Amino acid sequence: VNSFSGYLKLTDNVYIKNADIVEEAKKVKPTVVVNAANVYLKHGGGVAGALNKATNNAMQVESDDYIATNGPLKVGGSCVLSGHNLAKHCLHVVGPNVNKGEDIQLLKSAYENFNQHEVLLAPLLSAGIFGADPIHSLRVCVDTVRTNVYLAVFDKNLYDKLVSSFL
Numbered sequence: 001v002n003s004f005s006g007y008l009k010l011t012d013n014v015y016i017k018n019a020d021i022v023e024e025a026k027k028v029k030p031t032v033v034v035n036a037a038n039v040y041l042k043h044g045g046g047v048a049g050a051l052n053k054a055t056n057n058a059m060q061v062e063s064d065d066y067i068a069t070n071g072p073l074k075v076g077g078s079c080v081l082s083g084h085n086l087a088k089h090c091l092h093v094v095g096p097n098v099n100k101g102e103d104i105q106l107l108k109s110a111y112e113n114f115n116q117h118e119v120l121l122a123p124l125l126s127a128g129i130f131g132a133d134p135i136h137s138l139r140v141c142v143d144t145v146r147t148n149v150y151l152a153v154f155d156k157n158l159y160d161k162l163v164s165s166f167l
């Protein structure tokens with residue numbers, strides 16, 4: 001049993017809810033929240049901007065030190081940093097950004113990072129401002145992640161379309 005409430009069950013391991021991911025993290029304090037990161041960990045907008053704002057910019061300060069030491073992530077890659085006031089840990093995952101021309105086949109590699117964690121609160125990778133089709137992102141999620149994932153969909157309209165169209 002876990003703390004997640006109000007989710008629709010899609011599969012054995014994947015759950016979905018219409019929710020602001022910043023508000024869900026604050027309520028649950030999950031072990032892992034996933035950030036929709038870029039390779040520079042520049043948390044300017046979208047999920048990243050919202051998560052970072054909720055940490056009062058402490059996520060960005062920590063991230064800048066990580067990049068200064070390690071250099072940029074890979075598209076499809078990830079790193080584990082603090083969850084600050086939102087979670088124990090933040091898994092920063094880089095899905096491909098279609099608005100930068102990145103290979104959508106890297107979306108599966110991105111989701112494979114989730115398999116290193118038994119339970120996660122996450123957004124749909126490469127969705128929102130990243131430019132990919134969220135229906136496709138949900139399909140890749142279900143067909144890639146084997147650990148227990150609780151997906152937070154920001155738009156109510158999109159949430160209802162993802163559920164209604166789910167095979």
Ligand SMILES: O=C(O)c1cccc(Cl)c1
Pocket residue numbers: 020021022045046047050123127128129152153154155
């Ligand atoms: O695209 C999203 O899921 C998103 C974008 C910005 C803020 C939030 Cl809470 C969510």
